[PDB]
Amino acid sequence: DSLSSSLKTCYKYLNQTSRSFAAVIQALDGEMRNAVCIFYLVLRALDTLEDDMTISVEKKVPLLHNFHSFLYQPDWRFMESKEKDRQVLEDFPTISLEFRNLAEKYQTVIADICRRMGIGMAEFLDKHVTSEQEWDKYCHYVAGLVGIGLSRLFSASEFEDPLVGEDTERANSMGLFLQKTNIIRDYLEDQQGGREFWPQEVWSRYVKKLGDFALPENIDLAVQCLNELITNALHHIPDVITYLSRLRNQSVFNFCAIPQVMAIATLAACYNNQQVFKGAVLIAVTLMMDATNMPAVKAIIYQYMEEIYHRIPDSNPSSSKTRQIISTIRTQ
Amino acid sequence: LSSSLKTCYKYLNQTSRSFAAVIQALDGEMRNAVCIFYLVLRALDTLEDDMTISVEKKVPLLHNFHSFLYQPDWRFMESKEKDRQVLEDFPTISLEFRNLAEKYQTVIADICRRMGIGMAEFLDKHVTSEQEWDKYCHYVAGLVGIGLSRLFSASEFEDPLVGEDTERANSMGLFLQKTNIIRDYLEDQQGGREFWPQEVWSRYVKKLGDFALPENIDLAVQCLNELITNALHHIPDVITYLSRLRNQSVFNFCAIPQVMAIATLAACYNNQQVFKGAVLIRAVTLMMDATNMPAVKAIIYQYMEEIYHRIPDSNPSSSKTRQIISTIRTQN
Amino acid sequence: LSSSLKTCYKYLNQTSRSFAAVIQALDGEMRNAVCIFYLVLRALDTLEDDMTISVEKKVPLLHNFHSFLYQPDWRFMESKEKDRQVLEDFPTISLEFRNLAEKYQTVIADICRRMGIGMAEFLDKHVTSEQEWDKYCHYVAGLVGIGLSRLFSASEFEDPLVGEDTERANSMGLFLQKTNIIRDYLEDQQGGREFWPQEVWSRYVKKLGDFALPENIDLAVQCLNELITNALHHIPDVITYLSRLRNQSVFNFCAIPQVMAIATLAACYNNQQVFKGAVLIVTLMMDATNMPAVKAIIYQYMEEIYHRIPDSNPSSSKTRQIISTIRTQ
Amino acid sequence: SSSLKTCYKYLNQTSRSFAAVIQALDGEMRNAVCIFYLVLRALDTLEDDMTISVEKKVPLLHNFHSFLYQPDWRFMESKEKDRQVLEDFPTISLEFRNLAEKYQTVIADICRRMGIGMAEFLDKHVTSEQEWDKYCHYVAGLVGIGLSRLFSASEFEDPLVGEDTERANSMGLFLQKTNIIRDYLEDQQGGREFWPQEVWSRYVKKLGDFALPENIDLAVQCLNELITNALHHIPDVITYLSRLRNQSVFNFCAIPQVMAIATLAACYNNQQVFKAVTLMMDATNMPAVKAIIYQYMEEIYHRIPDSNPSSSKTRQIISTIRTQN
Amino acid sequence: SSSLKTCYKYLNQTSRSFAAVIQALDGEMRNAVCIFYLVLRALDTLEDDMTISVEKKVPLLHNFHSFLYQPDWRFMESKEKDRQVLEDFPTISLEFRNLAEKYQTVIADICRRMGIGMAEFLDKHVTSEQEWDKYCHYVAGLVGIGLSRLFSASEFEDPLVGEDTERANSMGLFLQKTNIIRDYLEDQQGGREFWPQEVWSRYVKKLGDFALPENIDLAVQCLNELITNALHHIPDVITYLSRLRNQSVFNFCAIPQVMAIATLAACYNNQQVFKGAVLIAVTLMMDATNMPAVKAIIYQYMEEIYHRIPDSNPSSSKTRQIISTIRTQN
Amino acid sequence: LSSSLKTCYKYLNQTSRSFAAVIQALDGEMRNAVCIFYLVLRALDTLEDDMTISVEKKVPLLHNFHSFLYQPDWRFMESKEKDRQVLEDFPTISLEFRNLAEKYQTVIADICRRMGIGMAEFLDKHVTSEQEWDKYCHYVAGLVGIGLSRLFSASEFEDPLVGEDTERANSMGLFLQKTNIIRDYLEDQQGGREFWPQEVWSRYVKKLGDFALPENIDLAVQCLNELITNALHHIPDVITYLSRLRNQSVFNFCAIPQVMAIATLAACYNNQQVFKGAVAVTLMMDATNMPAVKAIIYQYMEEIYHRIPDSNPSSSKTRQIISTIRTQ
Ligand SMILES: COCCCOc1ccc(C#C[C@@]2(O)CN3CCC2CC3)c(Cc2ccccc2)n1
Ligand SMILES: COCCCOc1ccc(C#C[C@@]2(O)CN3CCC2CC3)c(Cc2ccccc2)n1
């Protein structure tokens, strides 16, 4: 009871802002627990700055660029946000304090990722995503680097093999899969917010304005685009399996696998589904197993791949591509 | 990689609803070996099941099926069944069969050979005694359990004992087969197929189809309970078999189907719904899945109690049902 | 196998809806030893429950129960309780008890002896203070956690450190017992039994039975939340105790009931239904058979409670504090 | 950081017996134990500097724990060999403040309590055997306790390890009593007396009389009585070591204990103090450590002269250690 | 327990190479093995006492196992060094009876069968190599068998350990043969002969001749032949050790075996064996507490012997043969 | 047992004094696989070493050695080396090789091939740069560590992760190789070959053979310390690699040699004997568990550190790498 009330506040913020990762983060072994919790909170504060449209580009860029350094400015905080999670910015001193209490080896990793992410975020403030190549670049900045950072923390803690943090491509794929999935799922919500994440070079081959997919008379063209993007995302699954297969720590495995499975289940539920453009989407041998051991995770993944495979319209324009990537996933 | 192997996995996912995923999740060489084993048995079953194939043509097909595995160009183009693709493109499947290590080939062909003979033996007859019921189930399921066990031991992912104890392996197949036969009474009766042992049901009604008559519901349920009680006798062997597995991917593959079958019997016990369509596959279970032996034991024991709780003193098999469950409870 | 052993397992399933399966799933010798431990405790509990047994007749039965384990012909035929069969056919159970290895016998007899003293002590009084609550729960459940832990170590399936940690083993039992006491308010009130601590409920109403009256539902829910908050304080010990276990069958046996109790408090928290009857119960992509998963499940249930805490509730700050402590460390 | 590198440089320059096993500890325990050692090294250096007046030393020992939080604190007036850890204390304190809070609380608490005890024995010598235990508690028992709390706080060892302070105390006492008994001569030729007065007085008038040849006979008897006292801690030592589950921690704890026991077996009834199966097993697993311990107990037992005033007691404590389990 | 405390005093009093690893055994094995050792010590002390007439000795050996259940039994007429365990046998037997029946059963059965064998060799010397194995079985092989049965009975080790009496017998024979080889001179000077006559008679007329300087070269050749014979038990020793799972049991078993192997390597082609006592580098970095380390140590000692084999030695081929088998057996 | 397998182990013991014992102590299938691996590599090395074979003849023998494993009758009767028995009786060895499971044969052949190629590359040239020194060491040692790591995983006694780490497995080999090279300076000098990197020694004396002359002893020990400082940089990889192992037999096999090498570098550091002939807590624990191996390593690092002359041209470097190892 004597210990850090500032750390208790950090865990309060974690549960306040994260519905999908708080439980598995708090379940991580030893040192990984606080390091990952803090990593999530600083990223949350950085993301809130990027998302706040009341902050002009001119004022925002320097904040994004120096955020990694604010981690070492004890009294720094930001009181001008109107975003829902602004509490992490207004009470950033409590968070940076605990960040500075982490072992240096973890601080180095977190700061490096924050620095790089800030640079990438600034880069995209005055431009939308065009090519699929730019889509990967953007996803790398806001998610790929997170997978890389998390992996570096795992190896640094010694709970996982040095290889985990070294193979940045596989770590990058973990983040990209989760990011592309959410982006595909949150089309309608993002569109109603003025933000666009779907690659221009893809939706433009369907409609004149991305926002057109929101209108009923374009539902067909929309779903087709939806399926092309989902097909794109599926290409990360082989890396995801490789990455998970290298994990040896149960708490880390649960942390990494559960979110990936939920993401795969989301793509399966969105595939060739019109509800993606009308609102939010929602949820048998798999119901017998959880995503806590590799063979079960593989089984769960394959079930979802077949669920998508048998719904692939010969009609749809991505049919051949979708079947091909699923076959690649199946034949190991 | 291989175009033919990718094709095999495509056929596996297209034909197997409940085994495709756990199969694809199997470690190393077991994966292709079991995938191919499933496909060849699927082709064999498709031939036996095709009523447009005369007995004159069918007996030779069933007896020699195993040898077609060795003939590069063999295929069957006269099937009128839904899964005929595996027969018409058998060369692709047999090619992969011949690519498997010789030790796996020995197992698969031996089983196909013995299964073919057995199926041929039953083309002209229905099941009479309970002994004949066991014989039939051995031919179409027990031998499969035996084959799988031999593949596991041959691959060395499991100890030699798994493949050597054919009676325990046979019990695994019999339990699944009997459970399916009991559950599918109505669907089969409407398909002109009879699998319930005649020496058992003849003690209740004159025609097996009479159980579908509302005025015979009481006798039908009594018979149902007698057959379920019969199947419960395989449980001790199932627990023994599963308790011997050391490979997680193999455990998942074997344990899940057994748990689903047990859940099914529990849902069917003393349930009139069995004779009015498919049944409702209905505590301390909720918090645990079937991926570790102790949990599997607990789930199995819980289902035995669901049955025990419903045993009416007036049922003709009540004492026998209590007796076998009591044996399952007490055995360590 | 043995005729008498078959009978014991028959009795286990007759008197246990939530433990029989995980007990039967225990490895080697723990199976029979835990089955027998359950049965003798069921018998002791039935004697304590029977209101048709005068207190002066009951005190010796409770004090001497442990010695009856060594009396081949001892049985009790004057009970009218629902589980009386274990008392009327106690010779069958004591026989199997005497068939257990001596190391298990010693632990079981010792716990029965100590529990008997505690139950006898509370026959003429109700739980007053929260400290008294902990004491009564120690007698009927804490000692059981301690006994079970010693059985685990005795069997060698668990490290000696498991049985040695009597403090946290005690917390494992207290948590399950308090949870049941909280949930079973109405059931016990209509049975003439009172388990809610008087120093706590008297700050709300004049009679514990008053919580049954619809016009006190508000006060009732406040006391409910205060008791739940008290119970939550054992979770840190539970997590520490579970984290030490290395045998899968033992882990399932201990972890599942704790998670089920946690799920129960979450469902009962700030729930008016507790006073009108029974209350029924990431989290789905993981079950409770590995420690990290059990932690995640517990944390999800804690947020379930945290998010529903009313500012007006008199225990609100205390409730947040303990959940915060659980989350943070 | 260079500051953490400097800390390990000091660790190696100051510790002959623990530097290696400390650096071999798993994860978090490594830096926490390294820092704990350095701060204790700095405190002991202050405690031993005779050029520091009492009125100046007492408050320093009492307030040492507080310097851990003062970024700029350092001591520039020491003439001791390891004065570098005092002159560059800011480097050590910086790394202490970088440790997780749970380790900081333990280290600070122990330093505060040891400083109190050290100041208490500046103006006096050890008289009774009870005072001897009190003195050893302050300079060593508390160290075992501190270390145990760190092991438990790191989660590498069971909660019980840090909670059982008596067993932890015994670990420290056994090491300290062994070094005190062994270093008799060196201490006398240094102006310090650590052997309990109520013990040596029963053999001579002045503790320094043991050095003179004409008293060697009485010196060895006193020597054997003290060793017999020390042996009483072995049961707790076995109990403590038996609870360890982390190999790096076991090595760290077991090796020094065995070396200490080997030392008492060498000093038993040996005049130089005042002037089998073993070779096939090392101290890296509990059963081996036990075997080794029993071996040394017999080397001592087989050498208990019936004429020695403590003969009976010595035999009794060895007997208790043998029949334990 | 004052009586149990006395038993451990005797153990340390009589055992120099086993008391430490015995006292380090986990749980119930500790007292069971301690008692087992004390009873055998007493039995061996009687068999050794030459002041006891044969007609008076045979009964003692044959009925020794029964004295375990005779609370007051004891022997006051022994003049041997370890007579304390006999004079105060009541203390020892008391603790024996405090042991779990399953342990008592094993111990008494071994004492019985051992007593039979000892009595049998009271009037004869060891002739054939077959009889040497027989003799060693009676005084050591059965001990390995009894100990293994105690391990399995305690459940600290699998049932196989106590079941494979062959491997267990081999464990005992290797230790006994090594000690018989090493203690030639001491035994000879003590008036006892343990070397097999069919082996030594091929070199000299009397076993005692090996104690004469003039026969030193023949003595060494016989020595090498007997060592070559003992080496044949190594395969079984490795197999037996590789099946153990309890660390305290492993140390108890491995240390004495490694020490015996070290002893044979030191005695091989060594004249010192007939003049006095023989005192026992990748090995440097290893201790005998983990199977792979134990294997490595054994292999090193084998090459130590192999490298010293004389071309002209009458057993050279056999020695290289068994060593080669040990090197190759996986 | 097969007489051909017994013969192999006979040769193993004949040509190995520090590896035979730990090889024979390996679990299951690793035992014969590693034994055979050692034997073939010994043959290959013997060929390179033989100065009676012309470069025109040697090259082919090196480049194709990996193929001789599948040629039942292949052998070599023209060697003058001490271990020619392995070449002259290679058929006995290839036979057992072909008895190994395919997964082991693959690994072994691959390494032999890549090794032969690399070896032929230095038949005429000497070691120039340190970069080149690692290159040569990678060929005769580095690749061996990789092959071994792959056999551990192939056997499955070790996690797939072990074989995957080619970089640290390579460092394991380079560390042992540089140590033997540094130590055997004089023997290799009085033997004909030069392995010390030219770029390094040519900065102290004009002829590498000059270190053998008393009027250079000082310059000698200085170059010595500089090389040891180079080899020390591999220790962090060694510790990391060893820390991953889970099989006791494999750990003992890998750990003992690394520790023996470290002890060797500590004995040679700032030691003159290197240019003439040959050359507590630690004594309480052996190299069979990782924490003990760390402790032993650290004690040796201290033995070298407290002997670092602040005059030596490497003093700064030596302290820097040791500091890194200590705080790692
Ligand atoms: C490591 O400890 C984990 C904590 C488990 O804690 C507890 C605490 C109490 C009980 C209980 C009980 C009862 O005696 C009370 N009544 C309900 C069950 C039985 C018989 C009548 C039980 C149930 C129980 C009792 C005996 C054997 C198995 C389970 N568990
Ligand atoms: C598990 O098998 C491992 C092989 C151990 O084999 C053996 C064989 C013989 C003995 C012995 C003996 C003696 O009876 C003979 N003499 C010397 C020691 C004692 C008393 C007199 C001993 C010593 C012994 C006897 C009883 C208990 C423990 C050890 N060990």
From Swiss-Prot, chain A:
Cellular localisation: Endoplasmic reticulum membrane
Chemical reaction(s) catalysed: 2 (2E,6E)-farnesyl diphosphate + NADPH + H(+) = squalene + 2 diphosphate + NADP(+); 2 (2E,6E)-farnesyl diphosphate + NADH + H(+) = squalene + 2 diphosphate + NAD(+); 2 (2E,6E)-farnesyl diphosphate = presqualene diphosphate + diphosphate; presqualene diphosphate + NADH + H(+) = squalene + diphosphate + NAD(+)
Predominant localisation class: endoplasmic reticulum
Record key words, sorted: Cholesterol biosynthesis, Cholesterol metabolism, Endoplasmic reticulum, Lipid biosynthesis, Lipid metabolism, Magnesium, Membrane, Metal-binding, Multifunctional enzyme, NAD, NADP, Steroid biosynthesis, Steroid metabolism, Sterol biosynthesis, Sterol metabolism, Transferase, Transmembrane, Transmembrane helix
Biological processes per GO annotation: cholesterol biosynthetic process; farnesyl diphosphate metabolic process; steroid biosynthetic process
Annotated metabolic or biological route of this protein: Terpene metabolism; lanosterol biosynthesis; lanosterol from farnesyl diphosphate: step 1/3
Keyword Transport: no
Tissue specificity remark: Widely expressed.
GO terms, molecular function: metal ion binding; squalene synthase [NAD(P)H] activity
Chain residues that bind Mg(2+): D47, E50, D51
Highest rank taxon of the organism: Eukaryota
CC terms in the record's Gene Ontology section: endoplasmic reticulum; endoplasmic reticulum membrane; membrane
Membrane-spanning ranges: 251-271
Chain sites annotated for binding NADP(+): R19, R44, R185, L282
Needed co-factor(s): Mg(2+)
Enzyme Commission number, as recorded: 2.5.1.21
Membrane topology value: Multi-pass membrane protein
Stated role: Catalyzes the condensation of 2 farnesyl pyrophosphate (FPP) moieties to form squalene. Proceeds in two distinct steps. In the first half-reaction, two molecules of FPP react to form the stable presqualene diphosphate intermediate (PSQPP), with concomitant release of a proton and a molecule of inorganic diphosphate. In the second half-reaction, PSQPP undergoes heterolysis, isomerization, and reduction with NADPH or NADH to form squalene. It is the first committed enzyme of the sterol biosynthesis pathway.
Protein name as catalogued: Squalene synthase
Organism: Homo sapiens (Human)
Gene name of this polypeptide: FDFT1
Residues of the whole record sequence present: 34 to 369 of 417
Swiss-Prot record, chain C:
Residues involved in Mg(2+) binding: D45, E48, D49
Broad EC category: transferase
One of the protein's GO biological processes: farnesyl diphosphate metabolic process
Pathway: Terpene metabolism; lanosterol biosynthesis; lanosterol from farnesyl diphosphate: step 1/3
Cofactor: Mg(2+)
Domain of life where this protein originates: Eukaryota
Keyword annotations of the record: Cholesterol biosynthesis, Cholesterol metabolism, Endoplasmic reticulum, Lipid biosynthesis, Lipid metabolism, Magnesium, Membrane, Metal-binding, Multifunctional enzyme, NAD, NADP, Steroid biosynthesis, Steroid metabolism, Sterol biosynthesis, Sterol metabolism, Transferase, Transmembrane, Transmembrane helix
GO cellular component: endoplasmic reticulum; endoplasmic reticulum membrane; membrane
UniProt-recorded Gene Ontology molecular function terms: metal ion binding; squalene synthase [NAD(P)H] activity
Family: Belongs to the phytoene/squalene synthase family.
Protein name per the record: Squalene synthase
